Amino acid sequence: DVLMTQTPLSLPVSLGDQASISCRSSQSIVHNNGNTYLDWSLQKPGQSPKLLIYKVSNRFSGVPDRFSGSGSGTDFTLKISRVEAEDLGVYYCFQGSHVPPTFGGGTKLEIKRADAAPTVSIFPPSSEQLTSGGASVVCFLNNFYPKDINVKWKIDGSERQNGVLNSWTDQDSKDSTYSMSSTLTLTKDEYERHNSYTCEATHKTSTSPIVKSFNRNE
Amino acid sequence: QVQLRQSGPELVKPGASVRISCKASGYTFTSYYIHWVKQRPGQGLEWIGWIYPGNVNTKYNEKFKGKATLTADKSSSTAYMQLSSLTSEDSAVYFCARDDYDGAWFAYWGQGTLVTVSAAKTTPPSVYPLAPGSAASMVTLGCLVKGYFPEPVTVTWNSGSLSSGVHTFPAVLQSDLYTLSSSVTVPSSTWPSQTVTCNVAHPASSTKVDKKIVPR
């Protein structure tokens, strides 16, 4: 079964830059017929994919000439001479010369900007939830770049992993930052056994995690 | 010009079958292939199978054999996909795509159809205020929206006049029920000195809840 990997998974870039996305195949994707059926598509969030390059080099109807495809055999490259904002989205490479066709995992064009530490905010469960027997401790990690981040929970100082749910937003359309939400769900009675509740964030911007805690005094 | 119009979103019980239509316009329907692509939010793109109305021919993905059943009507230029024993993992957006002759497998794509497989009954959300533990430029408040079906839910702050510095997070499946959190960052001179309220709208359960974010 043919396998397609796109070598940059995320591509941070500034508007009007050089852009190169690679695509490798598990085997030679040159068909016994002779042609090399490989396509580059662009999918914007909430939309269907749109064909850009087909048969390695050929530009589809209505595709601006900033885009181009090259390579043969297994190694293939898409090139954007000038990145144009409408260019942003998820670029997929595609193979269609073997029995079931296969897409690449996709490369995301993302806006490059300066580093920013997350703004960490921790929230005790509302006594409204508590009084009904449940206890969700929420922690917001907002407006950071770059994208990768860790969240650790401590209860009275002890690391806790179970019952933790995380959510991520895609890159913002205004400030180009990412934000993350993390909730620790417990029962009232487990939550009422411990005093200290800690949410700490590990990010490239600091050698030491940003800690935000609350002591269950109030 | 080339047009592919799809059925519209389906909310189906597990086990039950579903049919998605794909109407073709702007070309000879019988001259081209119609493919179907699955896109599960976390898995990328996946070929299901093709149909060629010219000789009713079908080719299927091994994964999908006996799961997907592709038909087409010539007189209505409408292609259909039926899927059978619906699993939680059949929750995806599904596209129909037509090719370019001697060019590419997928040239023109349909808008897509969202299929959501879940056994849950319409559930009103629980809204809990998230107020800070500490004291004092910027101050973040929050709203937890918990245990509701189906999506979608609408979160506003101060009836919507508070729109800068708002993050509404993608929902998570927490035991057959959706839950999400929305945060808002405001000047510390504005809260806690002012009515900050999140308004939560859930059309499916036909409910509106306002929560004054009050100090603990």
Binding site: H31, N33 | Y33, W50, Y52, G54, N55, N57, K59, D102
Partner: peptide, 9 residues
């Protein structure tokens, strides 16, 4: 008739 992909494989 056949379809080009069909002929392909």
């Amino acid at each position: 008739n056949t379809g080009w992909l069909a002929g392909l494989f």
